[PDB]
CSV table of C-alpha atoms in Angstrom, one decimal:
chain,number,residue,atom,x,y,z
A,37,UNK,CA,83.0,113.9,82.5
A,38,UNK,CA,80.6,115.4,85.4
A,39,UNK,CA,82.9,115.5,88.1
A,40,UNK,CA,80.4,116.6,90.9
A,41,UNK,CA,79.0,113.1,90.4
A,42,UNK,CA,82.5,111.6,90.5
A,43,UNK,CA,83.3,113.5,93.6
A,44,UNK,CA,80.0,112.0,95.6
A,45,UNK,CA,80.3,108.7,94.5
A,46,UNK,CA,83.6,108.6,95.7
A,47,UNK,CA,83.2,110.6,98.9
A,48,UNK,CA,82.9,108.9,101.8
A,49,UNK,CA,83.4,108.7,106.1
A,50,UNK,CA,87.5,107.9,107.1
A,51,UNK,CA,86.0,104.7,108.8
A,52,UNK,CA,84.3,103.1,105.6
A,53,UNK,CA,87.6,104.6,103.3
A,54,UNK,CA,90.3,102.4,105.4
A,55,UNK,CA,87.7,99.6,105.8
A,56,UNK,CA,88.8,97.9,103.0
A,57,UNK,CA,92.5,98.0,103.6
A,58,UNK,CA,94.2,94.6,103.8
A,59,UNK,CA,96.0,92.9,106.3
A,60,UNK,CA,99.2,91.6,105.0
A,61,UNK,CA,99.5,94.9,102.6
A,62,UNK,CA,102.3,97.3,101.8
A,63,UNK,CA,100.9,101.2,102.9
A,64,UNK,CA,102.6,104.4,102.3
A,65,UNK,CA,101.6,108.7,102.6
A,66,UNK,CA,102.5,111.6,102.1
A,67,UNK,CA,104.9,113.2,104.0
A,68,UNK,CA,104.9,116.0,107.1
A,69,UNK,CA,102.3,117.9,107.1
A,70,UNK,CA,100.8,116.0,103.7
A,71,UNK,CA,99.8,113.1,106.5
A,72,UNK,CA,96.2,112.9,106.6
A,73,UNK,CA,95.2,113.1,110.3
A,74,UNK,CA,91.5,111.7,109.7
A,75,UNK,CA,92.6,108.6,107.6
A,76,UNK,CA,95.3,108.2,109.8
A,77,UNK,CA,93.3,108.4,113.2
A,78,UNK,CA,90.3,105.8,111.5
A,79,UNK,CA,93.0,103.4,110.5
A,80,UNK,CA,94.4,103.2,113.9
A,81,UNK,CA,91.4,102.9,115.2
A,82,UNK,CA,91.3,99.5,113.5
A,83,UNK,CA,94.2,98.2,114.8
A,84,UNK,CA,92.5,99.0,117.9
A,85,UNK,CA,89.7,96.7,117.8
A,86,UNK,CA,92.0,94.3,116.5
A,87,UNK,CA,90.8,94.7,113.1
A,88,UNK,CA,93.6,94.7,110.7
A,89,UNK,CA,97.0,93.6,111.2
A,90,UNK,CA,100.6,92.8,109.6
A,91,UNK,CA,100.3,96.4,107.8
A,92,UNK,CA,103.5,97.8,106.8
A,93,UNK,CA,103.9,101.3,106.7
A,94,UNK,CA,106.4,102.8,104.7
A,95,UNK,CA,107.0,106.5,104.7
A,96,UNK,CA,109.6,109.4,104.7
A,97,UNK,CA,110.1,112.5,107.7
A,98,UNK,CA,107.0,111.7,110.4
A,99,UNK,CA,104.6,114.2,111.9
A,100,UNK,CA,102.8,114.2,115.5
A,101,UNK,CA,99.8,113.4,113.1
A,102,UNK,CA,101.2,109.7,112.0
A,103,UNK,CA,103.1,109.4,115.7
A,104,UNK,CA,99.8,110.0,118.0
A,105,UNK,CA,98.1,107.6,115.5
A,106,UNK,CA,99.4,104.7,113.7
A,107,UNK,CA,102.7,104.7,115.0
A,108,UNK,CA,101.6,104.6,118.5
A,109,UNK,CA,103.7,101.8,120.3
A,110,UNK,CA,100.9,99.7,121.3
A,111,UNK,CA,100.0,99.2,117.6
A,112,UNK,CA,103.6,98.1,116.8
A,113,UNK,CA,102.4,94.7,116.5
A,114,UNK,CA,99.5,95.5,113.5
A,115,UNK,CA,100.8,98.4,112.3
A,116,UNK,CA,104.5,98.2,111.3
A,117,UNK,CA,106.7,100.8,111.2
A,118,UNK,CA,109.2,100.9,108.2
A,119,UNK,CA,110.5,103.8,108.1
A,120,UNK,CA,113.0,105.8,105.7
A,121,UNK,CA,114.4,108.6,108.0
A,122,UNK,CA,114.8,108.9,111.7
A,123,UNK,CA,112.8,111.5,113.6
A,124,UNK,CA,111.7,112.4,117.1
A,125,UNK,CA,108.9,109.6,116.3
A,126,UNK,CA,111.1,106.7,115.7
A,127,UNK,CA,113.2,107.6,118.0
A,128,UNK,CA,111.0,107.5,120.9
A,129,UNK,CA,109.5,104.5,119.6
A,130,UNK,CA,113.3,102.6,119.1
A,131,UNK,CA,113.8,103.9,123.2
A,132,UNK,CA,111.2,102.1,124.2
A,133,UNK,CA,111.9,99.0,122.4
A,134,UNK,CA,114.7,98.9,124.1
A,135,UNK,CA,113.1,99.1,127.5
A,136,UNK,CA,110.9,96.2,126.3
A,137,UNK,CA,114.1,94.1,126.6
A,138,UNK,CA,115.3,95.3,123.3
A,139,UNK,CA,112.2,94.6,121.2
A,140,UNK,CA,113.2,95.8,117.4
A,141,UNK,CA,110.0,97.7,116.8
A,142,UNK,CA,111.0,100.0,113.7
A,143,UNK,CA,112.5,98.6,110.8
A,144,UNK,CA,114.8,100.8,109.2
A,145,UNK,CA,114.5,100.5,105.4
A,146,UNK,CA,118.2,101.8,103.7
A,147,UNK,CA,117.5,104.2,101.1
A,148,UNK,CA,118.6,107.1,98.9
A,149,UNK,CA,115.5,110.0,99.2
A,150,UNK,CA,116.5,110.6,95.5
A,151,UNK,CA,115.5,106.9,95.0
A,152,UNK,CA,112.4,106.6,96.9
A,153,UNK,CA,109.8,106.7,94.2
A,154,UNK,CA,111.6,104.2,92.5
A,155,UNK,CA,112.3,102.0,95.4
A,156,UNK,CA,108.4,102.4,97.1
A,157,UNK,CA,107.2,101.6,93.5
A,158,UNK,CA,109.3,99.0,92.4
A,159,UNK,CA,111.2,97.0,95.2
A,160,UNK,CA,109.0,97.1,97.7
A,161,UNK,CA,105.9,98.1,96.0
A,162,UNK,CA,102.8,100.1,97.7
A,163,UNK,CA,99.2,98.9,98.0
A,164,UNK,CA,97.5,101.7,99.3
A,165,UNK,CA,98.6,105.7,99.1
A,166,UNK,CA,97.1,108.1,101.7
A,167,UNK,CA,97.4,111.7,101.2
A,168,UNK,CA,95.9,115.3,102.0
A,169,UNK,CA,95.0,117.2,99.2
A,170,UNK,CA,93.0,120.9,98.5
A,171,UNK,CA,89.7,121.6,97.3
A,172,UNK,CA,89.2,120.2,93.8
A,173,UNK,CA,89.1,122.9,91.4
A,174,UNK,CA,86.6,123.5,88.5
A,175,UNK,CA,88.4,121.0,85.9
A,176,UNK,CA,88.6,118.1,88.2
A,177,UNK,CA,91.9,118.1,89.9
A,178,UNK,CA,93.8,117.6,93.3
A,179,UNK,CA,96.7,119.4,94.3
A,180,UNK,CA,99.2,117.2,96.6
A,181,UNK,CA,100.1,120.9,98.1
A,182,UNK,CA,102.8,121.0,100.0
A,183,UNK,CA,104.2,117.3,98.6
A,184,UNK,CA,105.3,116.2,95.9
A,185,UNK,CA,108.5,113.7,96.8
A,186,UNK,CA,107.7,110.5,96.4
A,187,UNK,CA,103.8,110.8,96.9
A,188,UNK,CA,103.2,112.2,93.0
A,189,UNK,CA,104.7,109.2,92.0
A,190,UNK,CA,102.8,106.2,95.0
A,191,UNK,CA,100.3,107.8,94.6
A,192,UNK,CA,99.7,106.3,90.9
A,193,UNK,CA,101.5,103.5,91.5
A,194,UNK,CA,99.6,102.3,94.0
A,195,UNK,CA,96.0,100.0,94.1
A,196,UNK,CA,94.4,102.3,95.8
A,197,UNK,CA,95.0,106.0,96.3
A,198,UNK,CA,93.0,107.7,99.2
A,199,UNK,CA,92.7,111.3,99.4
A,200,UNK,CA,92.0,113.3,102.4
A,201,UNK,CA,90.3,117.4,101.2
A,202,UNK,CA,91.4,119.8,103.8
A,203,UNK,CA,91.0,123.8,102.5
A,204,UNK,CA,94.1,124.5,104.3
A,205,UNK,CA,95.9,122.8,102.2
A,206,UNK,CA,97.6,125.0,99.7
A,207,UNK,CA,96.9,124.6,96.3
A,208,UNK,CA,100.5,124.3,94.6
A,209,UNK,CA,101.3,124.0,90.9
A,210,UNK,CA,104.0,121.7,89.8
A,211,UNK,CA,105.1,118.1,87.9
A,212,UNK,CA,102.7,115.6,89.2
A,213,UNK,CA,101.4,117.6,91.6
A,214,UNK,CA,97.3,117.9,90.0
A,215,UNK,CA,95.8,115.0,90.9
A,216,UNK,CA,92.3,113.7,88.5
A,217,UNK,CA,89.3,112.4,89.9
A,218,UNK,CA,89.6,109.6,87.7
A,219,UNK,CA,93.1,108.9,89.4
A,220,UNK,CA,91.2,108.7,93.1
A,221,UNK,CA,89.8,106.0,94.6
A,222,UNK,CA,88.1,107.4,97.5
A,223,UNK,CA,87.9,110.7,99.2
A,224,UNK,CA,87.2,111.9,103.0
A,225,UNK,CA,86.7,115.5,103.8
A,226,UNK,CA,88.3,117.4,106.6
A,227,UNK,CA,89.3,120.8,107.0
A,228,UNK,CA,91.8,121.5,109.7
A,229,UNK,CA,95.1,123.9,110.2
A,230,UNK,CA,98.3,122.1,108.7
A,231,UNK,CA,100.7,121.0,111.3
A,232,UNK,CA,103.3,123.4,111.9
A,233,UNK,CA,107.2,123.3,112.2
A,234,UNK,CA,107.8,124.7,115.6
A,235,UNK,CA,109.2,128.5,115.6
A,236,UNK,CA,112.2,127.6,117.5
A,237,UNK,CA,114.3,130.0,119.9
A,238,UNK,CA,117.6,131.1,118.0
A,239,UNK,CA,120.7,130.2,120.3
A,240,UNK,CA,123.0,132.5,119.7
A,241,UNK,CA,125.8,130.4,118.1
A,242,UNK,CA,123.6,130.7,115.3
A,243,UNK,CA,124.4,134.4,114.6
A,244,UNK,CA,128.5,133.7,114.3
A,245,UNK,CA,127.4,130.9,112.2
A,246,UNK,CA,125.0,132.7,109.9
A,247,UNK,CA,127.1,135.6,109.2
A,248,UNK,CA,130.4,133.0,108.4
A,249,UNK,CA,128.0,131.8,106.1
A,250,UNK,CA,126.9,134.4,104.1
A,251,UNK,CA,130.4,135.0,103.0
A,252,UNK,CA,130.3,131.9,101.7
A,253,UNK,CA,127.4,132.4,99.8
A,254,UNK,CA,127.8,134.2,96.1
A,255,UNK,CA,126.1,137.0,93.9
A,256,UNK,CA,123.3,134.6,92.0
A,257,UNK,CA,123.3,131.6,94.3
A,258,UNK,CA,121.3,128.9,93.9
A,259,UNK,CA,119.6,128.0,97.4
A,260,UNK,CA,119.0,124.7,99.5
A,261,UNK,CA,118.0,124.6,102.6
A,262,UNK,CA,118.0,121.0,104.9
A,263,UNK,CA,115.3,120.2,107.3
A,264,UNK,CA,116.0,121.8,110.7
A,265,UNK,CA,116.0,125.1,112.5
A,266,UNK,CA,119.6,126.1,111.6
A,267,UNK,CA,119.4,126.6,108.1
A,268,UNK,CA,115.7,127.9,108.1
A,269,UNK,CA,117.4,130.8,110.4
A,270,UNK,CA,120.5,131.3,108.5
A,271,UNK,CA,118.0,132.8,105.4
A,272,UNK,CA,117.7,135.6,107.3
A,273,UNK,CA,120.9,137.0,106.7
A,274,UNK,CA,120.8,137.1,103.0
A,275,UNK,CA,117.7,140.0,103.1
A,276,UNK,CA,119.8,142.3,101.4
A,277,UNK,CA,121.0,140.0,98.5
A,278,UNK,CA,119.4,139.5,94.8
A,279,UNK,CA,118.8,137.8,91.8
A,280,UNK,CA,118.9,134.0,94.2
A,281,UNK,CA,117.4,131.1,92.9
A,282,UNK,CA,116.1,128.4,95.1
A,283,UNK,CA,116.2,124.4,94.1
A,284,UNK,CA,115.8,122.3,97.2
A,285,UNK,CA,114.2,119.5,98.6
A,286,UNK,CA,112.7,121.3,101.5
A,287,UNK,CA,110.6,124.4,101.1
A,288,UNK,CA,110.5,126.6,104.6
A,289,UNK,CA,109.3,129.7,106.0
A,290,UNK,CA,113.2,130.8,105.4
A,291,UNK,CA,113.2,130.9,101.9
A,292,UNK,CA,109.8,131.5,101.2
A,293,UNK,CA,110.3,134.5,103.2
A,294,UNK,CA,113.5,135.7,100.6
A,295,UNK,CA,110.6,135.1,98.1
A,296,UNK,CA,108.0,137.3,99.6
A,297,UNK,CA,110.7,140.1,99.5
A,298,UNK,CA,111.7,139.3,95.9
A,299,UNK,CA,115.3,138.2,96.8
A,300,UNK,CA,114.9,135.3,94.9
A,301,UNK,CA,114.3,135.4,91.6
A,302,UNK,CA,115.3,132.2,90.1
A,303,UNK,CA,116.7,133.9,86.8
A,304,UNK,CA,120.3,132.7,86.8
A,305,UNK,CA,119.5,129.1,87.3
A,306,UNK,CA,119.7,127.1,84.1
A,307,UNK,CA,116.7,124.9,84.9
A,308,UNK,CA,113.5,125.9,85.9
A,309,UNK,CA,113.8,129.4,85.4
A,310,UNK,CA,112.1,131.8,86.5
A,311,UNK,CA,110.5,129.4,89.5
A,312,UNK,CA,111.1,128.2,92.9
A,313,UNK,CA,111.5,124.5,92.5
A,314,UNK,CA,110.5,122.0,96.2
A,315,UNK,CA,109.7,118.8,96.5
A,316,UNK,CA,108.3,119.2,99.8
A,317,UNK,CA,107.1,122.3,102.4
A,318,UNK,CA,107.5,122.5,106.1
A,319,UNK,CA,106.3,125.7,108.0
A,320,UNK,CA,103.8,127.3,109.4
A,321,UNK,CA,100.4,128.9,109.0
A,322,UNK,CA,101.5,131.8,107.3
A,323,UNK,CA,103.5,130.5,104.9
A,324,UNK,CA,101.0,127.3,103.8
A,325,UNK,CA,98.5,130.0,103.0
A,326,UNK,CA,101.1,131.8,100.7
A,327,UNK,CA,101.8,128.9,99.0
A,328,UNK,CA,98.6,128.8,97.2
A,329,UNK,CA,98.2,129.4,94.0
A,330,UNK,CA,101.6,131.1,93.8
A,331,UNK,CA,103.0,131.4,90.1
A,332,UNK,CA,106.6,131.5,90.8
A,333,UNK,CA,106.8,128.1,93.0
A,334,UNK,CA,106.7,124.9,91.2
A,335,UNK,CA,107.2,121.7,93.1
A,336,UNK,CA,108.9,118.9,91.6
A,337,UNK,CA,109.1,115.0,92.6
A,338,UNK,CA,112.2,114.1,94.4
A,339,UNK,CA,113.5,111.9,92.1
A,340,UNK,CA,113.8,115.1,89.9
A,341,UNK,CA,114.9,117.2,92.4
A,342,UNK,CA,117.4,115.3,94.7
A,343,UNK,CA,119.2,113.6,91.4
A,344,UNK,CA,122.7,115.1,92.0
A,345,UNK,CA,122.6,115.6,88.6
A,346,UNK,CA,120.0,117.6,87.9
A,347,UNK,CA,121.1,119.9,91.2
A,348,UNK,CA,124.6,120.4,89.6
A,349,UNK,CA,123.0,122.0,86.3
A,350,UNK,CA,122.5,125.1,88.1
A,351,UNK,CA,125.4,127.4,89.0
A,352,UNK,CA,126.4,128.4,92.4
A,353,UNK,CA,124.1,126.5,94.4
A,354,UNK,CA,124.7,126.7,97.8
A,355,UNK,CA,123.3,124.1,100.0
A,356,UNK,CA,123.1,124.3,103.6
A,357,UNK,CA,122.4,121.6,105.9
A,358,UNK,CA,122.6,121.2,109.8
A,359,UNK,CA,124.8,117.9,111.3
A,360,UNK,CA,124.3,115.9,114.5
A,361,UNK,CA,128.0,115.7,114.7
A,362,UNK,CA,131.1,116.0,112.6
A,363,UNK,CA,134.2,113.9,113.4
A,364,UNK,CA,138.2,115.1,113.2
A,365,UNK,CA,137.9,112.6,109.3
A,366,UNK,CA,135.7,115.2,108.0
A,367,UNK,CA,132.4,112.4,108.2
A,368,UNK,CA,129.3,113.4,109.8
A,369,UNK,CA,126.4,112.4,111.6
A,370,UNK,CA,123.1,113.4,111.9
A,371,UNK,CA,121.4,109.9,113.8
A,372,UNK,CA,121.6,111.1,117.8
A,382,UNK,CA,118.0,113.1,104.9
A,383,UNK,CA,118.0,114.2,101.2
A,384,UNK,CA,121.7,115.6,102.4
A,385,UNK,CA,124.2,113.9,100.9
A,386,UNK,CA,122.2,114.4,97.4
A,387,UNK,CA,122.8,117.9,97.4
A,388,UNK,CA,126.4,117.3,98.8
A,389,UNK,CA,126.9,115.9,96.0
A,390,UNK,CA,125.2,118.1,93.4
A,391,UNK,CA,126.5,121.1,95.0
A,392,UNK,CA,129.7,120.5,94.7
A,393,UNK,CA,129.3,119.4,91.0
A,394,UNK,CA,127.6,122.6,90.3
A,395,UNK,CA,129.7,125.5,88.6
A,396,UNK,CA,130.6,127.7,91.3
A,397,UNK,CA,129.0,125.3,94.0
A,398,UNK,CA,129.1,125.0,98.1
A,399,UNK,CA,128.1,122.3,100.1
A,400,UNK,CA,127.9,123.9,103.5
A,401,UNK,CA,127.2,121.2,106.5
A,402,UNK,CA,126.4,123.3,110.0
A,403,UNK,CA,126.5,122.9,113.5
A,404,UNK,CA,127.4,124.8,116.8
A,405,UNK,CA,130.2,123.2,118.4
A,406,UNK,CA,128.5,122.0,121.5
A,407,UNK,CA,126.0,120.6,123.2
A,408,UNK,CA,124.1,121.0,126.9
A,409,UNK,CA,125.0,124.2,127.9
A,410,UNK,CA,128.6,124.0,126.7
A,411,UNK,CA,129.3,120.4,128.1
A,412,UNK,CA,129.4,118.2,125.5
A,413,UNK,CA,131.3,118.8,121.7
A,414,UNK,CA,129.4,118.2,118.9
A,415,UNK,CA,132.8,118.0,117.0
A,416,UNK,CA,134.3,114.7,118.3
A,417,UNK,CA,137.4,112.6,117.2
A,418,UNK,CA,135.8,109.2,115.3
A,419,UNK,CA,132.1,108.7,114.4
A,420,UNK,CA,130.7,105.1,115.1
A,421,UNK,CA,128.8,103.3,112.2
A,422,UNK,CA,127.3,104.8,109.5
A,423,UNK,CA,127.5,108.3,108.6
A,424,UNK,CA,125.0,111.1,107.1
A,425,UNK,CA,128.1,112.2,105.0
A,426,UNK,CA,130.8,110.7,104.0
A,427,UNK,CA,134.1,111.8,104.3
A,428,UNK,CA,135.7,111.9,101.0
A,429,UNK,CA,132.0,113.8,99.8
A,430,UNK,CA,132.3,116.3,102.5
A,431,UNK,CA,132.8,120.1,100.6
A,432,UNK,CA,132.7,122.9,103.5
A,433,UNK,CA,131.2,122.6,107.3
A,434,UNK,CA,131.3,125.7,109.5
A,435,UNK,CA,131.0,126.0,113.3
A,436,UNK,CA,130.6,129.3,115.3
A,437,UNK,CA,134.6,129.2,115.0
A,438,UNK,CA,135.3,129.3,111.3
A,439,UNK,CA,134.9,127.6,108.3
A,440,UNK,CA,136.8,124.8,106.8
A,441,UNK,CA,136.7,123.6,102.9
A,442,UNK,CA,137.9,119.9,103.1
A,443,UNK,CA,138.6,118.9,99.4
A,444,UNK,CA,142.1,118.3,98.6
A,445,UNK,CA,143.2,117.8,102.2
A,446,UNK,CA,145.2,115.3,103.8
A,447,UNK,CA,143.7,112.6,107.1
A,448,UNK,CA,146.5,115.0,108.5
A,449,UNK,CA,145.3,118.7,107.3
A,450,UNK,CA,141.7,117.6,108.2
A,451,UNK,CA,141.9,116.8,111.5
A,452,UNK,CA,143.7,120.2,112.3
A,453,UNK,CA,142.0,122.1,110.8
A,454,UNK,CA,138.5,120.5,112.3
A,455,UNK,CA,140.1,120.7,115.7
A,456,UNK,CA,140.0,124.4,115.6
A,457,UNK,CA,136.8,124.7,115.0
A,458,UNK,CA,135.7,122.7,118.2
A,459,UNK,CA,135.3,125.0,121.2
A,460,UNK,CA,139.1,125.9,122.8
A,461,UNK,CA,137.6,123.9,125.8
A,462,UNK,CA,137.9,120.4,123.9
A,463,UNK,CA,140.8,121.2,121.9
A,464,UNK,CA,143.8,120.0,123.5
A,465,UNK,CA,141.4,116.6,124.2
A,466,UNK,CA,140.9,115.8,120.5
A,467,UNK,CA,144.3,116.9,119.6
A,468,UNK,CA,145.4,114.2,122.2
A,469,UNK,CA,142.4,111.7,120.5
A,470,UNK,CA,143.8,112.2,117.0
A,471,UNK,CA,147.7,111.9,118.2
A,472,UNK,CA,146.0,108.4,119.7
A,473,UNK,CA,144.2,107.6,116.8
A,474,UNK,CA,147.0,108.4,114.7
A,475,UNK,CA,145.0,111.0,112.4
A,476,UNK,CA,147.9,113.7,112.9
């Protein structure tokens, strides 16, 4: 019960921590900014000398922090991607496969987010959990911060759970999200900024889009927001609303922002009410450090969160997520996330919008982001598609027709490409 004791028994360097990690093993950790660089950077290390090797990494939504580390492409052959989602990261890393004479290099695992905990846990099953956590507090606890997704969850599961202490982590109340001593395995200590989501330049298609958008979005909504710069912006039209609620996957400087100015309130959602429920945060700075200790912000494991159950139990949700590409069927594409969850679950909800966003094109105006057939798999499919908006309008796609659909998504492509995929569809015989 003396926890000081615990905490130096257990404290060690990141080169002894990793040390002991197997080769031939199953590894996961946390997600974004909830990568712990130190860890991270001393595991790689490893692979580096040659050390370790046949490690599988399984993980959800990469950060520079995993990407300058373990999943640098000279370690591809130790340390194995096998990833969930497709960022920047892998998508660097698939290019250059490729170039190797098409060397498959990242091994795409399948997977529902709402499922992950279940699937890390269970299916696959994870040996080792690393994750950055704040300070411990008087009583003997962790706080995963700005995680909670599957990590709450792995990070029980698993043999071995490896925490990395870092002050700037925010501490951050919620279901899982305290951590014992007893529950750790090992602890490194290193106190540096969180990464940041990059404060991106607004293009100004995103102004038609927003304000479309808020039309759409009733008295007493219940927000989420998708990864990605669009939506994050589009909060900042709905300054002069009240009485919001917020239930989404990801937590950014967007809606934290419509916390900070008491827009939200979270008193007309059935569940959780009265808090601001995340299951993970992407931001900056500014908004980490207002995270912390903050009453009225619970986070809440995916599983929870993403079940489009769950989402429809609150009325009016709104979510809002940015596409890739939409095609003249209504699918779309976001592969050049926890969407089609709260597709679902929006549209379930009493009073609900799913709202899928993009600007209709692409380099400087030449290339349409709207397009006539989408090759493969989709991010959403077609008969789950609710509402997706363009700088040109909006569209709600229940009820209609292959016909009605592909007209009315037409017109929401820039005049420029129109008569093109009216002559695609006629050829594809959509209309």
């Amino acid at each position: 019960m003396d926890i000081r004791a615990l905490y130096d028994e257990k404290l060690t360097t990141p080169e002894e921590a990793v040390s002991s990690i197997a080769s031939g093993s199953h590894l996961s950790m946390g997600m974004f900014a909830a990568e712990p660089p130190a860890l991270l950077k001393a595991l790689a290390d490893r692979a580096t000398r040659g050390d370790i090797g046949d490690l599988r990494v399984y993980y959800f939504e990469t950060a520079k922090i995993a990407g300058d580390t373990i999943l640098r492409y000279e370690l591809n052959n130790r340390i194995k991607p096998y990833s969930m989602f497709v960022t920047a990261v892998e998508r660097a890393l698939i290019r250059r496969g490729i170039e190797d004479g098409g060397r498959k290099v990242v091994n795409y695992v399948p997977s529902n987010f709402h499922q992950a905990p279940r699937l890390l846990a269970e299916e696959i099953g994870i040996d080792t959990f690393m994750h950055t956590v704040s300070p411990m507090d008087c009583h003997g606890y962790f706080s995963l911060g700005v995680g909670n997704d599957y990590s709450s969850r792995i990070a029980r599961s698993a043999r071995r759970f490896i925490v990395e202490v870092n002050r700037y982590m925010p501490r951050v109340q919620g279901e899982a999200a305290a951590i014992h001593i007893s529950e750790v395995d090992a602890i490194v200590e290193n106190h540096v900024p969180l990464i940041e989501m990059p404060v991106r330049s607004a293009i100004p298609e995103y102004t038609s889009i927003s304000h479309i958008i808020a039309d759409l979005v009733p008295d007493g909504a219940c927000l989420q927001m998708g990864v990605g710069a669009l939506p994050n912006l589009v909060c900042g039209v709905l300054k002069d609303r009240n009485d919001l609620g917020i239930h989404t996957d990801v937590l950014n400087p967007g809606l934290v922002d419509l916390i900070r100015r008491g827009v939200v309130t979270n008193q007309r959602k059935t569940l959780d009410r009265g808090r601001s429920v995340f299951t993970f945060a992407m931001g900056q700075q500014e908004m980490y450090e207002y995270l912390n200790d903050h009453p009225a912000i619970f986070s809440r494991p995916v599983d929870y969160v993403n079940d489009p159950h769950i989402i429809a139990q609150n009325d009016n949700v709104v979510s809002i997520n940015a596409t890739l590409q939409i095609d003249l069927t209504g699918a779309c594409n976001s592969e050049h996330g926890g969407q089609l969850d709260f597709v679902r679950g929006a549209y379930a909800s009493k009073g609900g919008r799913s709202i899928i966003a993009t600007p209709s094109t692409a380099a400087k105006g030449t290339v349409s982001r709207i397009i006539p057939r989408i090759d493969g798999p989709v991010t959403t499919p077609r008969i789950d598609t609710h509402y997706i908006v363009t700088e040109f309008g909006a569209v709600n796609l229940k009820g209609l027709s292959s016909t009605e659909r592909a007209l009315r998504i037409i017109e929401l492509a820039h005049p420029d490409f129109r008569d093109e995929l009216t002559q695609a569809a006629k050829k594809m015989h959509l209309i």
